[PDB]
Amino acid sequence: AVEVEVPGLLTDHTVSSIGHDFYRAFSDKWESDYTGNLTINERPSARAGSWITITVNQDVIFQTFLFPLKRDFEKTVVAALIQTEEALNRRQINQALLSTGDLAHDEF
Numbered sequence: 001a002v003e004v005e006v007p008g009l010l011t012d013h014t015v016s017s018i019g020h021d022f023y024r025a026f027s028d029k030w031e032s033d034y035t036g037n038l039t040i041n042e043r044p045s046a047r048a049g050s051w052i053t054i055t056v057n058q059d060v061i062f063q064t065f066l067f068p069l070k071r072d073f074e075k076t077v078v079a080a081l082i083q084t085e086e087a088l089n090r091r092q093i094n095q096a097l098l099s100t101g102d103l104a105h106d107e108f
Contacts, residue, residue, distance in 0.1 A: 007035045009057075014042040018066045018073060019050040025077040033096065034088055042066075052076075054084055061087035 012023045019042030026040060043051040053063040062083045064076060085093070097103060
């Protein structure tokens with residue numbers, strides 16, 4: 001490896017009783033092979049909870065719905081970590097993993 005967590009721009013652009021905690025819960029388990037230039041946005045919608053939308057620099061790559069009465073929040077946080085890199089895995093990480101250390105965990 002010989003690498004350090006130097007880059008990053010995770011901002012608490014979140015204003016919901018669940019979406020404010022998604023910021024902290026995501027960043028507590030966040031890890032990445034790319035430059036890590038991502039931020040977390042939410043839209044509060046009292047019909048159901050919050051929309052969560054993660055953006056890399058200025059571009060959306062993953063988004064999902066959070067619910068405050070349900071217990072999926074932890075699972076939805078952990079799943080957003082994988083789904084954030086799965087957007088970038090065919091954009092740019094594809095050349096890095098092909099050049100040295102192809103995948104062997106979950107192809108399809």
